[PDB]
Amino acid sequence: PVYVDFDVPADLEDDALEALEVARDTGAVKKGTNETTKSIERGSAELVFVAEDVQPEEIVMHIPELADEKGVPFIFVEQQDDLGHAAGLEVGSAAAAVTDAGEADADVEDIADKVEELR
RNA sequence: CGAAGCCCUCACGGGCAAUGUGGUGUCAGGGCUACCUCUCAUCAGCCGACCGUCUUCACGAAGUCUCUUGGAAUAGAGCGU
Ligand SMILES: [Mg+2]
Ligand SMILES: [Sr+2]
């Protein structure tokens, strides 16, 4: 809410979570806010995911401003448990990162482009 | 480093845990990279006392002889242990 500056449509989110499921089974992904933050800093992040229902908002608060000064694209997910299932976890995840995509590189590229147009 | 983890249950199974269980590390700073050497430190865990002290208990030597006084010798005098 405080870190959210744009509303991502349900259709764009469906595409994004589908792309994340094939990103773990082919390439590699990072699960958890700590591992997402280190990826943006180490530069090894292609597309970063962040949940909208994070209480407290502090945990994830930094991701939008950090990704902007590191050129890493980001997208918002409405629910926390859906991002966890998409990353391949029984639990939820406040944030996930795609560390080098796999057979989804063409999809991720377009998702990164659809978000830039949405400001 | 990143689920490699913890709890309940005989098990089955359940619960916890990416908002981080668990590994590493804690100023002889540590970590990462590159090598040298090596450990007996530390932490976890097993076993598990002596002595001493306090209390309680068992065992444990040698006269109940003489005379006088006395209601009564545990007294006096005598002899003995
Ligand atoms: Mg430790
Ligand atoms: Sr949760």
The answer to whether the CB of A29 falls within 8 A of the CB of A20 is: yes
Question: How is chain A split into domains, by residue range?
Answer: 1-119
Please, which experimental method was used?
X-ray
Residues 6+ apart with CB under 8 A from A9: none
Q: Please name the fold of domain A1-119.
A: 60s Ribosomal Protein L30; Chain: A; (3.30.1330)
Q: Which bases along strand B come within 7 Å of a protein CB atom?
A: 1-3, 16-20
**Cα torsion A12, A17, A20, A25: sign:** negative
Closest nucleotide over all strands to A56 (CA to C1'): B19
Report the side by side order of strands in the sheet with A74-77: A29-31, A95-98, A47-51, A74-77
Task: Tell me the structure's resolution in angstroms, rounded to a single decimal.
Answer: 2.8
DSSP A40-101: HHSS--SEEEEES--SSTTTTTTHHHHHHTTT--EEEES-HHHHHHHTT-SS--SEEEESS-
As a dihedral over the C-alpha atoms of residue A30, residue A2, residue A13, residue A93, rounded to 10 degrees, the angle is 30
For chain A residues 48-107, those near strand B by a CB cutoff of 7 A are 53-56, 59, 80, 84, 87, 89-95
What are the Cα distances from residue A96, in Å, to A75, A86, A117?
A: 10, 9, 22
